[PDB]
Amino acid sequence: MQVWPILNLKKYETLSYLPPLTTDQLARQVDYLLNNKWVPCLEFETDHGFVYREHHNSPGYYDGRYWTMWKLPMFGCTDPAQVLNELEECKKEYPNAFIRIIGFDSNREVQCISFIAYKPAGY
Amino acid sequence: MQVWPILNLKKYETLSYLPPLTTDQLARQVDYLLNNKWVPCLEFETDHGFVYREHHNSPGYYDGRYWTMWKLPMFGCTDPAQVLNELEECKKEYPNAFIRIIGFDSNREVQCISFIAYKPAGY
Amino acid sequence: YKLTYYTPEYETLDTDILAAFRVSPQPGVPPEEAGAAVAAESSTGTWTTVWTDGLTNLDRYKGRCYHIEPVAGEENQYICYVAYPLDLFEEGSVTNMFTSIVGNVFGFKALRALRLEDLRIPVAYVKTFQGPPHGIQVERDKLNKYGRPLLGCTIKPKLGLSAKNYGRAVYECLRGGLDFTKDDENVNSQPFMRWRDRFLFCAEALYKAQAETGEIKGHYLNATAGTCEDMMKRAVFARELGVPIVMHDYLTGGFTANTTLSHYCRDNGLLLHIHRAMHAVIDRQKNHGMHFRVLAKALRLSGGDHIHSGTVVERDITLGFVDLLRDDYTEKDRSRGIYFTQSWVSTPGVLPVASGGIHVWHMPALTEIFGDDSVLQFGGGTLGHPWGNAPGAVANRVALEACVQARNEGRDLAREGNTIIREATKWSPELAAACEVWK
Amino acid sequence: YKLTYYTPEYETLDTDILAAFRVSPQPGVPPEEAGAAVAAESSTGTWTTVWTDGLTNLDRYKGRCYHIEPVAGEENQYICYVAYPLDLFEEGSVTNMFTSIVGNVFGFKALRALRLEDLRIPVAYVKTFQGPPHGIQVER
Amino acid sequence: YKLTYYTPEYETLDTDILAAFRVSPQPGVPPEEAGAAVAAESSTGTWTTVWTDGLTNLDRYKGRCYHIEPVAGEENQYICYVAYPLDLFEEGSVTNMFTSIVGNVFGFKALRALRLEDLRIPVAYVKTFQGPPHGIQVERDKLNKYGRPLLGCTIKPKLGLSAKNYGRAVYECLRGGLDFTKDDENVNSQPFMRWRDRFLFCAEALYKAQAETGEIKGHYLNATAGTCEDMMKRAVFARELGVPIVMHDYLTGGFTANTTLSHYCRDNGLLLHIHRAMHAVIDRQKNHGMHFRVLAKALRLSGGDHIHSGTVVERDITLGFVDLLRDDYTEKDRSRGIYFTQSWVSTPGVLPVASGGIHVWHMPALTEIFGDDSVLQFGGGTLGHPWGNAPGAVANRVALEACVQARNEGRDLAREGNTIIREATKWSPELAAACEVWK
Amino acid sequence: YKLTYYTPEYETLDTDILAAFRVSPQPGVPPEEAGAAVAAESSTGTWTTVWTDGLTNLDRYKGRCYHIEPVAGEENQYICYVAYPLDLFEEGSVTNMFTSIVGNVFGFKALRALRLEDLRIPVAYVKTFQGPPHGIQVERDKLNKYGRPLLGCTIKPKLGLSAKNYGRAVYECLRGGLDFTKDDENVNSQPFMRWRDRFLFCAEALYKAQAETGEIKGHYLNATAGTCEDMMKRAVFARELGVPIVMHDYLTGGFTANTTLSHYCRDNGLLLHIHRAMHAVIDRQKNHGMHFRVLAKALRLSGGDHIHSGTVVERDITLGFVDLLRDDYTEKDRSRGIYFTQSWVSTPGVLPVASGGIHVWHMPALTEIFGDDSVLQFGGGTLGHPWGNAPGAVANRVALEACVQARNEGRDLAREGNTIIREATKWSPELAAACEVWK
Ligand SMILES: [Mg+2]
Ligand SMILES: [Mg+2]
Ligand SMILES: [Mg+2]
């Protein structure tokens, strides 16, 4: 019988309970978005990358949901290598940031994807 | 005339004003639970082990009351050595945690016991 | 009746409320008369002539059986299509919609049994309702959860635990990776656990789990009560606590109270989880009652963000009404029990909730059948894990994510589901532990 | 279930809510099991064991099929009598009374059909309701 | 009367309110007539015949003396048992229950004295009341305090200190280890200390002590006032401060006001401490009045979480009504003054509060007699310690915990109490200091 | 104590609240110590020394036994006079006045028994209360009734009649000449007669009787309830009906609720009738409790227009407290049980209500003993008349008026009462009929 840890076990939603994704698994998740005609985009956060409540407390309001856009959504992107290249670029400029890949479905007109692609120092 | 200290004098409810319990006193408290047919269970807290108010302020609401369950209540436990063995186990995995023994009276259907069994570094 | 109410030449208007009834007449009653009886009995139609009928134009208010078709493989059973003019209904009142259509006919002597199978709600009438307080896309944005089904855990036993012990179970469940915990439909306010104490302890537990994991959590706080006043007091305290979601048993509480709660949820930002307790009293038998798809459309109008919708694991019938709850437009499809094409003119969709005796091994099937937009509820599937709630929650969250990853990679969940689960047990001791207790 | 929920020796309490259900089981389901299913399914009764049950005394909250009698002239149909403890219900809430008793059972797979025929509402529960705003004599 | 009201053949109904009266008739009045007088005088019974009696069926509304038994060792005194039909009472109104039973009889000429000893409240009537806002188990869960009696300290002097000085005393008491501080029953709002200033300074003091010790603390803020409005204003400010507990003198404020406060406490999560000021005016003499157990049942119905119940250190009479306040079911037991078996059908129990001239040396006796579910209140027993309030609080908290540990280890508190205290003085300078001033 | 609390040299201040206690000490306790105990125990006085006492000046807050006198013909019983400083009390709160003085002492071990006989309420404290909503003179002006006692009739049976039948009895009583009808103290809201139905039918009946006779009529509508909210709802409906008077059981409802109702009555023009149900539980025994005159002063402060005060027919004790309820100033008079001179500084007087087993033959005695300013209540004395309520009412109204005329003419009611009644029977068939059933 093992006890689920309490310390330093913050999660980042979808796919964050699986072992970290390799470059190849990353590449396949990004191909899923492309094959569905969803637009990839990267987001990064240098401060705390989890939800909290600082500015308001009413139902449905949380701080920490929005992170900051790395450049712009990659419209007309056809190759996952383009996305992973930006991930590399973002990681170099922000080795200290949490970086996730998100996607937009301009047809349903909503963000439809969000998974952690890189976490810094022992997170 | 002696002045009751102000610094680092946090308490943990029942039995926390007595000198720390030896293994033998621990064993007798646990036998009291068994002899009453109450189910022993361990709880531990790595962060702050005292009551505070972060998320709400209305009457009767406090944060820090719930700690986290070490495994499951020990139903059908007949020997205190079983409990103290888990205490040892918990202490090894969480040498930095506050660990208390609690008990449940499934007949009154309520938690009925709660006493500090281990406190870390100079607490 | 035959003459006035059976109108096979009738062209339905886009403003008409259309109904498909499964009619089983008494022997000796031909279909056309029965269909004419169903239409008259659910609209004008009086046993004797009255002088006041000459004061109006009753043709403009009558129900019209415009079509009849035999039911295959059944003896003496037909599907009769009835059209009701828009003017018969009170704007925004599901209560009146049901009273007008279903309030009187079912007791007709000439009928041996009667079942309402579907309703085509015209867009002009759809626009008079608020619909879901939030709906699928808004809920995902608020909770910041994308690309996978949501996970819930129903707390058991339903009765017996004290408020604090109940809250302890809530914390252990949420910290393990599930998104929501839930109050059983029976849990309102009772001697051993009054509602306010429950709300309060559940609030402490969910905030503790949210702070621990970094993920937004919620607990469906049951606001179902004996009066509108009591129900509103419970929802108001939820708002006060700043929590995300409340719950209502829409059939036992009723449509008038549900609509009130739905409007309050919209105005205060609360998500609304709907439980369908008592539905089987009405929708079970094929010969008499109302099919669940009709009750599902009603809920989408009155309002709710989640709606319990069974478990599949008649697949097709279920998938049919899942589309009716989620999509903006669903075309007529008899193979799926969809009798009418239905448009929603942008009314938000409702998240279907699968529940009932499910565990890790159903995960690939549930994901494949429902897709991302669903909530998978696990009671014993979590609270029955050998290592406790947190590990039970982790096993479920891991199995789900393994399935989503695999699907996204192009694997066939239908054919490889068991393998995807087995593969994850090699690295998840929690899942490995669950798999041993289950398949 | 059979073991925990079919209790023919049970003496109902004056505070118990009693229900008479007309049960039509699926072929192959004996009456005692069906009655036990009806009682479990409308009260505690979980498809799998849960550790939290040991936190309370579930015997005090369970529905109990205490009696079963065949229906005359019907094939495979019985009247099962179930007793529900007073503590399961919210005072003055017909909404909760119906949810607790009728909210879940009717969909049980083992049952082919199910009809609630009557309920004995105990006087202790009757006193929690207002009842008619006026009633017969006051109206006259 | 004799004929209509003395009914020895009567079988009481489970819905009947039963009363046991200690009757001392005037010489020359036989018991059966007196019992018949007590029943008539507290129900129908008119000095002259009235035509309106024929409009109803008075047998259905009359009180019935169904049994009479001599009192042992007393001259001319009997216990008469009277049954009152359920229909005589207003649902949820202790005020009406007392008016109906005790509002008229006590002045009857034929009686020399009269004392109500006990009442059997039927479960059907018990269900019409809210009962305690929270009760024992919920209070322990809220305060997160288990396995030992709670400790309080009454602030003195009751009058004379300014609000701030009063708050200073509150902080010094709480920081030492006591769970609660308390406003004297006389402390409402007076020239030298207005209620709001007191509430505010007490709030600062209790939060300071809670932050220092890490343990939840409370102060019984007295909300007793001259009008319902004033009383509600005080409770509302307590809610605003976010504190855990308010207090009410239920006998001097009265039952109507107490019930109002009890309902408000339930709806706002406030614990409610009840002080029984003025009780001795009513319950003291054995021959006339109402025994405290009757006033204790009334409070459990109207509502309160704590109730002052004496100090023992007639043990047995007291333990008898302690069971009536705490348990769900108490069997008839004359040796303990329990005249009727009483069921509560899950109405929460009330925590008995022992108070009055107690100090450290009574600790083993109080723990043994009351057990864990009690609140031990120490005024001079803390404020009289030579080193001040904090050390006075520590001495009490240590003595209590030493007793709980010893008991749990299987030691006999009855026989070893003094030794358990002496043993703790060897390691607690604070307790050693108290012991020197007391025994 | 002896030293600090027995102060025979003390000169009371005009602002002091003075109390006269009938003290029965335990054998072995001298009077001076007992008096000192009574004063300490009802004020400061702690079993052990506390450091906080040095923070104030406790001499300014202590009760002082300033005088002790033996009780004649009693063994070991004294009257101890205690003075309490004005600063101990909350302005306008009878609830606090009673808590401070009577909340603790009665249980003192050293005392065998204790009875509060009287209180001197200082004018400075009297000015903090509203007093009667209207009082004697204003009530007579409103009702336009002068120069004779008012007449009431209590409706019986108290329980059993339906609301309409109850109203029928009300109409028959009022139309006969009585000024008021009344709800029994037990009549609040019960299964066979809910309060609102009663209020409504009583309203129809009283307006019918008023229109028939041309005289203003009223019915004491009982507003006593379980909570302040319920009590206020009943008073509000009375206001809505436009009726003149409501009723309250001030002891069972309590002082906080009574004061609230009294203030509402003042602000809405409603007369307030007070029933003293349960008083005998407290005031009956000479040795322990509170004498009725103390409860009567309390009611005059909290507020009430009528107050039940017995029936006489200890005359002198009664007449003593009648003066205390009616007059502006009453001088000390031991022969009448008046221990202190009492001033009211223009607080309106309260109309005493005589009740209980009275009939026509007591009329000359009641008029003579109470005078014009009283309300004579006749239950069976009206409803028991052989020809019915109206004739029963006429017989009472005629007997009363015959007595008033005779008195005004200078006849001695004490000596000629029976003759004045006999003389009226020669011309009143209704009175002749009553006289035959009674004397
Ligand atoms: Mg459920
Ligand atoms: Mg006190
Ligand atoms: Mg009366």
CSV table of C-alpha atoms in Angstrom, one decimal, chain E residues 36-311:
chain,number,residue,atom,x,y,z
E,36,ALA,CA,-58.2,14.6,38.6
E,37,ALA,CA,-58.0,18.3,39.5
E,38,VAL,CA,-54.4,18.6,38.2
E,39,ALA,CA,-55.5,17.1,34.8
E,40,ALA,CA,-58.7,19.1,34.5
E,41,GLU,CA,-57.1,22.4,35.6
E,42,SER,CA,-54.3,22.0,33.0
E,43,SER,CA,-56.7,21.2,30.2
E,44,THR,CA,-60.4,21.6,29.8
E,45,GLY,CA,-62.2,21.7,33.1
E,46,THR,CA,-64.5,24.6,33.7
E,47,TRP,CA,-66.1,25.7,37.1
E,48,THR,CA,-69.6,25.7,35.4
E,49,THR,CA,-71.2,23.9,32.4
E,50,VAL,CA,-71.1,25.7,29.0
E,51,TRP,CA,-73.3,25.0,26.0
E,52,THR,CA,-70.3,25.2,23.6
E,53,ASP,CA,-68.9,22.0,25.0
E,54,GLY,CA,-71.6,20.1,23.0
E,55,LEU,CA,-70.2,21.6,19.8
E,56,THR,CA,-67.1,19.3,20.1
E,57,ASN,CA,-66.0,16.1,21.5
E,58,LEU,CA,-64.2,17.1,24.7
E,59,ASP,CA,-62.9,13.7,25.5
E,60,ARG,CA,-60.5,14.1,22.7
E,61,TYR,CA,-58.9,17.3,24.2
E,62,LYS,CA,-58.9,16.5,27.9
E,63,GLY,CA,-55.9,15.8,30.1
E,64,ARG,CA,-56.2,12.5,31.9
E,65,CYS,CA,-54.7,11.6,35.3
E,66,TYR,CA,-54.1,7.9,34.4
E,67,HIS,CA,-51.9,6.9,37.4
E,68,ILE,CA,-51.2,8.0,41.0
E,69,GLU,CA,-48.5,6.7,43.3
E,70,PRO,CA,-47.6,7.8,46.9
E,71,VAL,CA,-44.3,9.5,47.6
E,72,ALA,CA,-42.2,7.6,50.1
E,73,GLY,CA,-41.3,9.2,53.3
E,74,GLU,CA,-43.5,12.2,52.6
E,75,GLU,CA,-46.7,13.1,54.3
E,76,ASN,CA,-49.7,13.7,52.0
E,77,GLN,CA,-47.7,13.8,48.7
E,78,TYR,CA,-48.2,11.8,45.4
E,79,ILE,CA,-46.8,11.5,41.9
E,80,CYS,CA,-49.8,11.9,39.5
E,81,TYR,CA,-49.3,11.0,35.8
E,82,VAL,CA,-51.2,13.0,33.3
E,83,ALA,CA,-51.5,12.4,29.6
E,84,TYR,CA,-52.2,15.3,27.1
E,85,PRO,CA,-53.2,14.6,23.5
E,86,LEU,CA,-50.9,15.7,20.8
E,87,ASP,CA,-53.5,18.0,19.3
E,88,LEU,CA,-53.3,20.4,22.1
E,89,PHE,CA,-49.9,21.8,21.1
E,90,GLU,CA,-48.5,24.2,18.6
E,91,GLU,CA,-45.8,22.5,16.5
E,92,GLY,CA,-42.3,23.7,17.4
E,93,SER,CA,-43.4,26.0,20.2
E,94,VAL,CA,-41.8,25.3,23.6
E,95,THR,CA,-43.6,28.5,24.7
E,96,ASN,CA,-47.0,26.9,24.0
E,97,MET,CA,-46.0,23.5,25.5
E,98,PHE,CA,-45.2,25.2,28.8
E,99,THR,CA,-48.3,27.5,28.7
E,100,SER,CA,-50.6,24.5,28.1
E,101,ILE,CA,-49.1,22.3,30.8
E,102,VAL,CA,-47.9,24.7,33.4
E,103,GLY,CA,-49.7,27.9,32.8
E,104,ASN,CA,-52.7,27.4,35.1
E,105,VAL,CA,-52.6,24.5,37.6
E,106,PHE,CA,-50.0,25.7,40.0
E,107,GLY,CA,-52.4,28.2,41.5
E,108,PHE,CA,-55.2,25.6,42.3
E,109,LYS,CA,-56.7,26.1,45.7
E,110,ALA,CA,-57.1,22.4,46.5
E,111,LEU,CA,-53.4,22.0,46.1
E,112,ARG,CA,-51.0,23.0,48.8
E,113,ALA,CA,-48.0,22.8,46.4
E,114,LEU,CA,-47.2,21.4,43.0
E,115,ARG,CA,-44.0,20.4,41.2
E,116,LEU,CA,-43.6,19.2,37.6
E,117,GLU,CA,-41.0,16.5,37.8
E,118,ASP,CA,-40.7,15.2,34.2
E,119,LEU,CA,-42.3,15.2,30.7
E,120,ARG,CA,-42.3,12.4,28.1
E,121,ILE,CA,-42.1,14.4,24.8
E,122,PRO,CA,-43.4,12.0,22.1
E,123,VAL,CA,-41.3,11.6,19.0
E,124,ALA,CA,-44.0,13.0,16.7
E,125,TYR,CA,-43.8,16.3,18.7
E,126,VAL,CA,-39.9,16.1,18.9
E,127,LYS,CA,-39.8,16.2,15.1
E,128,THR,CA,-41.5,19.6,14.9
E,129,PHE,CA,-38.5,21.3,16.6
E,130,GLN,CA,-35.1,22.2,15.2
E,131,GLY,CA,-33.3,21.2,18.4
E,132,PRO,CA,-29.6,22.2,18.9
E,133,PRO,CA,-28.1,24.5,16.2
E,134,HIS,CA,-25.2,22.0,16.0
E,135,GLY,CA,-25.0,19.5,18.9
E,136,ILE,CA,-22.0,17.6,20.4
E,137,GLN,CA,-20.5,15.7,17.5
E,138,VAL,CA,-20.8,18.6,15.0
E,139,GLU,CA,-19.3,21.0,17.5
E,140,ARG,CA,-16.3,18.7,18.1
E,141,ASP,CA,-15.8,18.4,14.3
E,142,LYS,CA,-16.0,22.2,13.8
E,143,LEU,CA,-13.6,22.9,16.6
E,144,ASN,CA,-11.4,19.9,15.8
E,145,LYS,CA,-11.3,19.0,19.6
E,146,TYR,CA,-11.5,15.3,20.5
E,147,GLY,CA,-11.2,12.9,23.5
E,148,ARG,CA,-11.4,15.3,26.4
E,149,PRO,CA,-13.7,17.7,28.2
E,150,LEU,CA,-13.6,21.3,26.9
E,151,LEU,CA,-12.3,24.1,29.1
E,152,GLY,CA,-13.7,27.5,29.7
E,153,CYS,CA,-12.9,30.5,31.9
E,154,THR,CA,-15.5,33.0,33.1
E,155,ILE,CA,-14.1,36.6,33.1
E,156,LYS,CA,-14.3,38.4,36.4
E,157,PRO,CA,-15.2,40.9,37.7
E,158,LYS,CA,-18.4,40.8,35.8
E,159,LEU,CA,-18.8,44.5,36.0
E,160,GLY,CA,-16.2,47.2,36.3
E,161,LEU,CA,-13.6,46.5,33.7
E,162,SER,CA,-13.4,48.5,30.5
E,163,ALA,CA,-13.9,46.6,27.2
E,164,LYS,CA,-10.2,46.6,26.5
E,165,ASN,CA,-9.1,45.4,29.9
E,166,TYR,CA,-11.8,42.7,29.6
E,167,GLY,CA,-10.3,41.7,26.3
E,168,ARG,CA,-6.8,41.6,27.8
E,169,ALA,CA,-8.0,39.1,30.4
E,170,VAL,CA,-9.6,37.0,27.6
E,171,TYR,CA,-6.3,36.8,25.7
E,172,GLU,CA,-4.3,35.8,28.8
E,173,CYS,CA,-6.8,33.1,29.5
E,174,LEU,CA,-7.0,31.6,26.0
E,175,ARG,CA,-3.3,31.6,25.3
E,176,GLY,CA,-2.7,29.4,28.3
E,177,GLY,CA,-4.6,26.4,26.9
E,178,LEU,CA,-8.3,26.9,27.7
E,179,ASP,CA,-10.7,26.6,24.8
E,180,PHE,CA,-13.2,29.3,25.7
E,181,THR,CA,-13.6,32.4,27.7
E,182,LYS,CA,-17.0,33.7,28.7
E,183,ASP,CA,-19.2,36.7,29.4
E,184,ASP,CA,-21.0,36.5,32.7
E,185,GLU,CA,-24.8,36.2,32.4
E,186,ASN,CA,-25.2,39.7,33.7
E,187,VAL,CA,-22.9,41.1,31.0
E,188,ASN,CA,-25.1,42.4,28.2
E,189,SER,CA,-24.6,46.2,27.5
E,190,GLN,CA,-24.0,48.7,30.3
E,191,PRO,CA,-22.6,52.2,30.9
E,192,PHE,CA,-19.0,51.1,31.4
E,193,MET,CA,-18.9,48.5,28.7
E,194,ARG,CA,-21.2,48.7,25.8
E,195,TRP,CA,-21.7,45.4,23.9
E,196,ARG,CA,-20.1,46.4,20.6
E,197,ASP,CA,-16.8,47.5,22.2
E,198,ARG,CA,-16.7,44.3,24.2
E,199,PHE,CA,-17.4,42.1,21.1
E,200,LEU,CA,-14.6,43.9,19.2
E,201,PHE,CA,-11.9,43.7,21.8
E,202,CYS,CA,-12.8,40.1,22.6
E,203,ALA,CA,-12.5,39.4,18.9
E,204,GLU,CA,-8.9,40.9,18.8
E,205,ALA,CA,-7.9,39.0,21.9
E,206,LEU,CA,-9.3,35.6,20.8
E,207,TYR,CA,-7.7,35.8,17.3
E,208,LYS,CA,-4.3,36.8,18.9
E,209,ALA,CA,-4.5,33.7,21.3
E,210,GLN,CA,-5.6,31.4,18.4
E,211,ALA,CA,-2.6,32.6,16.2
E,212,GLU,CA,-0.3,32.1,19.2
E,213,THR,CA,-1.3,28.6,20.2
E,214,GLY,CA,-2.5,27.1,16.9
E,215,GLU,CA,-5.7,25.9,18.6
E,216,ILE,CA,-9.2,27.1,17.8
E,217,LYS,CA,-10.6,29.4,20.5
E,218,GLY,CA,-13.8,31.0,21.3
E,219,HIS,CA,-15.5,33.5,23.7
E,220,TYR,CA,-19.2,33.2,24.6
E,221,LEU,CA,-20.4,36.6,23.5
E,222,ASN,CA,-23.5,37.4,25.4
E,223,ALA,CA,-26.4,38.4,23.0
E,224,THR,CA,-29.1,38.5,25.7
E,225,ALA,CA,-31.0,41.8,25.3
E,226,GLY,CA,-34.2,43.7,26.0
E,227,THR,CA,-35.9,43.0,22.6
E,228,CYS,CA,-35.7,40.5,19.8
E,229,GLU,CA,-34.2,43.3,17.6
E,230,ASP,CA,-31.4,44.2,20.0
E,231,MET,CA,-30.6,40.5,20.5
E,232,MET,CA,-30.5,39.9,16.7
E,233,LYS,CA,-28.2,43.0,16.2
E,234,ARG,CA,-25.7,41.4,18.6
E,235,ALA,CA,-25.7,38.0,17.0
E,236,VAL,CA,-25.4,39.6,13.5
E,237,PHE,CA,-22.2,41.5,14.6
E,238,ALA,CA,-20.8,38.1,15.9
E,239,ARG,CA,-21.4,36.6,12.5
E,240,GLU,CA,-19.7,39.6,11.0
E,241,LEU,CA,-16.6,39.1,13.2
E,242,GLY,CA,-16.5,35.5,12.0
E,243,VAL,CA,-16.3,34.2,15.6
E,244,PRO,CA,-17.6,30.7,16.6
E,245,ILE,CA,-19.9,31.2,19.5
E,246,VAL,CA,-22.6,33.4,21.0
E,247,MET,CA,-24.5,33.1,24.4
E,248,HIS,CA,-28.1,33.5,25.6
E,249,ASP,CA,-29.8,33.5,29.1
E,250,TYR,CA,-32.7,31.5,27.9
E,251,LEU,CA,-34.9,31.9,31.0
E,252,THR,CA,-34.6,35.6,31.4
E,253,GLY,CA,-34.7,36.3,27.6
E,254,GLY,CA,-37.4,33.7,27.3
E,255,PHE,CA,-38.3,30.8,25.0
E,256,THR,CA,-39.7,32.8,22.1
E,257,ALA,CA,-36.4,34.9,21.8
E,258,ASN,CA,-34.3,31.8,22.4
E,259,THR,CA,-35.9,29.8,19.5
E,260,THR,CA,-35.4,32.8,17.2
E,261,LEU,CA,-31.7,32.9,18.2
E,262,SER,CA,-31.4,29.1,17.8
E,263,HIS,CA,-32.7,29.2,14.3
E,264,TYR,CA,-30.4,32.1,13.4
E,265,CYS,CA,-27.4,30.2,14.8
E,266,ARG,CA,-28.3,27.2,12.7
E,267,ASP,CA,-28.5,29.3,9.6
E,268,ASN,CA,-25.3,31.1,10.2
E,269,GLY,CA,-23.1,28.4,11.7
E,270,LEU,CA,-22.8,29.9,15.2
E,271,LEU,CA,-22.5,27.6,18.2
E,272,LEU,CA,-24.9,28.6,21.0
E,273,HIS,CA,-24.0,28.6,24.7
E,274,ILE,CA,-27.0,28.6,27.1
E,275,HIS,CA,-26.8,30.0,30.6
E,276,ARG,CA,-29.6,29.1,33.0
E,277,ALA,CA,-29.8,32.3,35.1
E,278,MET,CA,-32.9,32.4,37.3
E,279,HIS,CA,-33.4,28.6,37.2
E,280,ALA,CA,-33.1,28.3,41.0
E,281,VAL,CA,-36.2,30.6,41.4
E,282,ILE,CA,-38.1,27.7,39.8
E,283,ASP,CA,-36.4,24.4,40.4
E,284,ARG,CA,-35.0,24.6,43.9
E,285,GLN,CA,-37.7,23.5,46.3
E,286,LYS,CA,-38.7,19.9,46.2
E,287,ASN,CA,-42.4,20.7,46.8
E,288,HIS,CA,-43.2,23.4,44.3
E,289,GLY,CA,-41.9,24.4,40.9
E,290,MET,CA,-40.4,22.6,37.9
E,291,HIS,CA,-37.4,20.3,38.2
E,292,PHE,CA,-34.4,21.3,36.1
E,293,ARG,CA,-34.7,18.1,33.9
E,294,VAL,CA,-37.9,19.6,32.4
E,295,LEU,CA,-36.2,22.9,31.7
E,296,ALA,CA,-33.3,20.9,30.2
E,297,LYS,CA,-35.6,19.0,27.8
E,298,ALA,CA,-37.2,22.3,26.8
E,299,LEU,CA,-33.8,23.8,26.0
E,300,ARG,CA,-32.9,20.7,23.8
E,301,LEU,CA,-36.0,21.3,21.8
E,302,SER,CA,-35.8,25.1,21.4
E,303,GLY,CA,-32.1,24.8,20.8
E,304,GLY,CA,-28.7,25.3,22.4
E,305,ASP,CA,-25.3,23.6,22.0
E,306,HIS,CA,-24.1,24.0,25.6
E,307,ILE,CA,-26.3,24.3,28.7
E,308,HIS,CA,-25.1,25.0,32.3
E,309,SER,CA,-26.0,22.1,34.4
E,310,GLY,CA,-24.5,22.5,37.9
E,311,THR,CA,-21.4,21.1,39.4
